[PDB]
Design a protein around this ligand. Sequence first.
Ligand code: BA
Ligand code: BA
Ligand code: BA
Ligand code: BA
Ligand code: BA
Ligand code: BA
Ligand code: BA
Ligand code: BA
Ligand code: BA
Ligand code: BA
Ligand code: MG
Length: 1030
Amino acid sequence: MGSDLVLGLDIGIGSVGVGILNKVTGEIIHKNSRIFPAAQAENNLVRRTNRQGRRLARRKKHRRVRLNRLFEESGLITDFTKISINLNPYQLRVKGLTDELSNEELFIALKNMVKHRGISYKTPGQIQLERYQTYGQLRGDFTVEKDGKKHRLINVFPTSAYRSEALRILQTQQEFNPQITDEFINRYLEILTGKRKYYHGPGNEKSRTDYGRYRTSGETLDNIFGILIGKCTFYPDEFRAAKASYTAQEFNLLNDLNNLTVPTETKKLSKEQKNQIINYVKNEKAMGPAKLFKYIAKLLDVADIKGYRIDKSGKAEIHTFEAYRKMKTLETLDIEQMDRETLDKLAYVLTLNTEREGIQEALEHEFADGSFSQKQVDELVQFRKANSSIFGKGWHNFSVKLMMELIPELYETSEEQMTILTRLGYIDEKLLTEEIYNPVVAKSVRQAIKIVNAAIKEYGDFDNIVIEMARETNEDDEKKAIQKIQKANKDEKDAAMLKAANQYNGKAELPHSVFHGHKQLATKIRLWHQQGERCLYTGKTISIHDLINNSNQFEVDAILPLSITFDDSLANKVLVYATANQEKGQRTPYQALDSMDDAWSFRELKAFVRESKTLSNKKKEYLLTEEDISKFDVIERNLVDTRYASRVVLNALQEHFRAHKIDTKVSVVRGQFTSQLRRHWGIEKTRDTYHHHAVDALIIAASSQLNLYQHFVDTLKSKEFEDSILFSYQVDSKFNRKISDATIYATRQAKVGKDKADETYVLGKIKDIYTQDGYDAFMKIYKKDKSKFLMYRHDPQTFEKVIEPILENYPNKVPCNPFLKYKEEHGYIRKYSKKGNGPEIKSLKYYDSKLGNHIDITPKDSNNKVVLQSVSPWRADVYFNKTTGKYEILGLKYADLQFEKGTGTYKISQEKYNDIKKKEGVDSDSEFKFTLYKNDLLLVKDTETKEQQLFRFLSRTMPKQKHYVELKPYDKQKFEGGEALIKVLGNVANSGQCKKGLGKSNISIYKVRTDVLGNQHIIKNEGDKPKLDF
RNA sequence: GGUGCUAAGAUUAAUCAGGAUGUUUUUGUACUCGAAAGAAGCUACAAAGAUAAGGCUUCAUGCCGAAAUC
DNA sequence: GCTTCCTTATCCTGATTAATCTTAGCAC
DNA sequence: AAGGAAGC
Ligand SMILES: [Ba+2]
Ligand SMILES: [Ba+2]
Ligand SMILES: [Ba+2]
Ligand SMILES: [Ba+2]
Ligand SMILES: [Ba+2]
Ligand SMILES: [Ba+2]
Ligand SMILES: [Ba+2]
Ligand SMILES: [Ba+2]
Ligand SMILES: [Ba+2]
Ligand SMILES: [Ba+2]
Ligand SMILES: [Mg+2]
């Protein structure tokens, strides 16, 4: 308490409120808001989804390149330039089963099998070819109306079936005597069915990649998840200990016993007493929780024992050396023949590894050569799987090293682990967040520490540092209610396991074979029991015999899709048949159920849902929302990440204010107090503005010095307050973010509307005209300009003689879909033809927008440019032209940077940079001022009037409009629309988006940089040339 | 109040292994025109190619590219 | 040139490590 | 949300 200043922090996923106040005077010395959108770090799910998607399409292509190399070595084909892409590979995969195929014809049968090699956890070619013949289609997720009923097929088969089929084809071809060796057949089946292990990942011995096993340092890990194991609580360079290890079992039971309270001289047990119990249970075969307590009664009365962990339902529980007991059951070994650190090691190998090929490898590379026999590793493999429930329990918070120190002291001194430990006895934000793999938390952590390191730097050491926390303080009636639910959840788990075992065996438990390769049944079963054994989309029943023995037929569907909601809870989850899940797509049951070919009706869903008591409240809300959710609309992931980030700063601070003897108090406030206090104090929260972070932090810094005020509150409601608040934003300099919309667009030459000659038009298509979203789109184009539909122009027969007659004679009514009302009656609208022929009509392409700025991705094949659109920007280089006295803004995009051919570096070249300079309006003899990145700050001053406004940058918008820029407000997230600006800029557009051009005659622009606290300083001296150092 | 060991309930994150699509190019068949040859490139199915722009070297269970670093 | 408007690809299967909150027992 | 052509 050497100083008098108090610091408070309101740490979020996308903001950090800052606030300093004198605990004595009550003055507000500093209020500040640091803003870094969490949206960028949360995009990591998009990065991982696209990285794994890239690896799958890469390996699917490689599988057919290896096949091309196989056909050269075997000498079956040498010139691949004349292979025909127009035969029937499904028919060739049936002819080859009995009759002989050409080498070319065989290459077509195997390549087709390699491109779709099925899942892996009548041959397929015969099942497929027959779907081709009777339905006209194989691929994907489509509907069939057989036996007078609507059913749904998908092109999914097991890789064992494809392998079986492939092997039959190739042997039948061996009977016809070519270069089909037996090594040819083996190598092909490896291409077809070969797969990597989840614990090895990508690469080989030469392709070193730190995502996978073959590390770039040279190490070759046995398992890529071993390095992800947590570290010791107290020896941070010691890996944790398996909970099935001997050491962790020993430590846990001792700390269990020392916590007991028994009728003895010291009310606790003795060193000699511990040893007998440790020794008794180690040597007794069956050991439960209460059977151990009966043994404690002999060494004394069971109801006289106190101080023990309890079950959710009130049963007592205790450690049992269970792992150890079940290990003595090994016949080809004996745990008694092994010491501690080879028994501890056996739990490390059997816990991290879950499959045969992984256990066998770790036993060789961690245990000395010849320490295990092929007969002994056999039993251990079968032993690991037979007791996955015990080895799937994880890792102790302590390393072995720590317990080896804390175990003898646990025997002798009779104190529990915490008592023992005490007796024994500028923050680097990057080091604190080195091994925290959560870019949201790690960012919002690194930001909060970068502030105190900069607040101390300019305010000296603080008296106190307060941090709002997201915890609870439930009362006795409230704390009782929580465990009431927690028990009811664990009960309905086992209620479903019981319900499952009664209907599968009739017995009380389920065989452990049943959970191999299906670790998710205990949750699939819990949903099968909530839904009353019913599929909530088809209405068909779910039999645990199919749910267990043919679980391919089911998928766990997110009710409200994950792409929109990001709700990963149980309430957003149902167990339904697979084909029903795929037909649903990215929809809610409301949007989807009625328009599904195979399914219930929304009405029958509404019926079943509120006619059941086993379902949940939150699950009933989510199953029936008639709400048109979408992702472009004004989550639990945000609450977990806040608690995480806040706690890391709290712990890291108190630990820092100890070993460095700075001795600054580090206190804590809760959310219920600061929100109540906010009402009591003067808290008028401004609308949608970043002010409330800086003021919340001041309440945080004030709720501490509370015991010791009116001046401060008076000051808080001051007129001149929301004006003095400072704001600071984290600039985004990164290149190589998402470069464009993923949609691959086609273009055509046409004349539309007020057009004189040909013009390159980007196409759009209406994916489905039998939906109210697909019909609406049709009418919009139809009223505006019928000819936009490529059909009208290139097939007027179908338009004038099929579509217009349908538009006239069909209900249109609440609005309804005319095309759908035809589908129910006559089926899919068919293209015009004579003999009743003509294919179905499901989609309609039209001419939509003219081609403008794009990225070209046009095949060498194409008769038309194929392009990418909405090209995301990187930075803007601001120049000044002394002649005209105007500014000249050059815009760079993510897609202007490239990996260079020769060198391989990711960069942009002066040649390309100068070509962009040219077309952007920047004169080759103009002076560079500064570069603007995302969320840099501008100052824009009128020179005619000297009126000025502070903006923050978004990007350089509109390439046709030179020197145009989209800007964003200094104090809030976005503009309202119609907001007024300096005279020369006018008002913002009534949509919010402030898109103005900064190339006018008398305007002066200056770059503004700020620290993490909001200390602004002007810039114009950034350099001679722009920075392009890569 | 903070914190530790344990256990469970709830919710998340990081990373790996795979499936089936979707987008688009080309080709073939069907549909429309033509006596055919073919034309058209609409509409449907199928195959083949591309699939963030783009790069790597070690020639393959090949590797990297939408995060972080400010 | 300036402002208004339209638009934007997904559903799953298997596995491991880690984190936070909460309730319980014990302790500093 | 923000890229960027449409619409005037
Ligand atoms: Ba586990
Ligand atoms: Ba309360
Ligand atoms: Ba569309
Ligand atoms: Ba976009
Ligand atoms: Ba506590
Ligand atoms: Ba042609
Ligand atoms: Ba394809
Ligand atoms: Ba590529
Ligand atoms: Ba114009
Ligand atoms: Ba557009
Ligand atoms: Mg779904």
